[PDB]
């Protein structure tokens, strides 16, 4: 769940 954090900030 490290890879959809950051992918996730702008979504």
Same mark, same amino acid.
């Given at each position: =769940?490290? #890879? #959809?954090?950051? &992918? &996730? =900030?702008?979504?």
């Amino acid at each position: =769940a490290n #890879i #959809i954090a950051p &992918l &996730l =900030a702008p979504x």
